[PDB]
Design a binder for this molecule. Structure first.
Ligand SMILES: O=C(CC1CCCCC1)Nc1cccnc1
Length: 305
């Protein structure tokens, strides 16, 4: 038993991180087959970041302007092109360590693991949620750019995120691996507004089910509710509203614990109205929204890769 914020094992992704250098701007790139993907802002000088014309900047550049080191190795760039906000560098060598993988664009509330990197070397791994406002609350320094987010479904690495920027607010924005931003961010150093951030209600429900599994049962109560009365209370406290799809996703945890979804919402209701009153749930004094109902099930079933 027990309950931790687990990341996916990182091995399969470590063998794909390379160092990309253009002029004196060095950051991380992802090497799959014979292509290196990286943030297209690698071609900017710090002066260039206030108002980049990427088409104009990329034309001054040539294959041999780009240094791709894979540890002790240099790769040879023989084609270069821009897909939206990513640079695709065709290299002379397919990565022998290219796992089974796909590119996926994820939805708000989905969780993934980040391999944080500097000069193409892995630093650490953590789990996080894509916020409803399309930002992540990550841990990135300078040179972390090109660090990626990924899920593993047995043996297949799904890549969903590439790190491009910190906002003046200290939260983190980037792209899918086709180079389209999550949210309304642009890769320009200007004041940009994240939305209002909401709580991922379906994840909090998944996590109360995880508490009940692990013996922590104090918040369960006699009461109940409907979807509508629940959703009314949720909106007041900046919680995302709950649909029928969400109830369908919770059914296995409802079957495994013998607690109706609506009964769990009734318990959640009371906590938003009355709070914890000093108590904790799975050793936390706040309501946690960074576990999906899939994460909870995976961790309480012991699903491997
Ligand atoms: O925010 C950036 C990149 C932006 C990209 C757009 C132009 C300005 C620089 N760097 C970074 C990321 C994470 C932690 N520290 C620094």
């Amino acid at each position: 038993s027990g309950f931790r914020k687990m990341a996916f094992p990182s091995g399969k992704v470590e063998g794909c991180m390379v160092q990309v250098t253009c002029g004196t701007t060095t950051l991380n790139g992802l090497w799959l087959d014979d292509v290196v993907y990286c943030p297209r802002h690698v071609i900017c000088t710090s002066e260039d970041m206030l108002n980049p014309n990427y088409e104009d900047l990329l034309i001054r550049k040539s294959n041999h302007n780009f240094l791709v080191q894979a540890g002790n190795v240099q790769l040879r760039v023989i084609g270069h092109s821009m897909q939206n906000c990513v640079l695709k560098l065709k290299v002379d060598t397919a990565n022998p360590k290219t796992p089974k993988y796909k590119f996926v664009r994820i939805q708000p509330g989905q969780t993934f693991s980040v391999l944080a990197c500097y000069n193409g070397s892995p630093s650490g791994v953590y789990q996080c949620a894509m916020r409803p406002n399309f930002t992540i609350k990550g841990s990135f320094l300078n040179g972390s750019c090109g660090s990626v987010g990924f899920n593993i479904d047995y043996d297949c690495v799904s890549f969903c995120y590439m790190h491009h920027m910190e906002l003046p607010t200290g939260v983190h924005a980037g792209t899918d691996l086709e180079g389209n931003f999550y949210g309304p961010f642009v890769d320009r150093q200007t004041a940009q507004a994240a939305g209002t951030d909401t709580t991922i209600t379906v994840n909090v429900l998944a996590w109360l089910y995880a508490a009940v599994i692990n013996g922590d049962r104090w918040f369960l109560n006699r009461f109940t509710t409907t979807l509508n009365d629940f959703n009314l209370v949720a909106m007041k406290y900046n919680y995302e509203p709950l649909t029928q799809d969400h109830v369908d996703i919770l059914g296995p945890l409802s079957a495994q614990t013998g607690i109706a979804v609506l009964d769990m919402c009734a318990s959640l209701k009371e906590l938003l109205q009355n709070g914890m009153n000093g108590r904790t749930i799975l050793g936390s004094a706040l309501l946690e929204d960074e576990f999906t109902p899939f994460d909870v099930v995976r961790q309480c079933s012991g699903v491997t890769f």
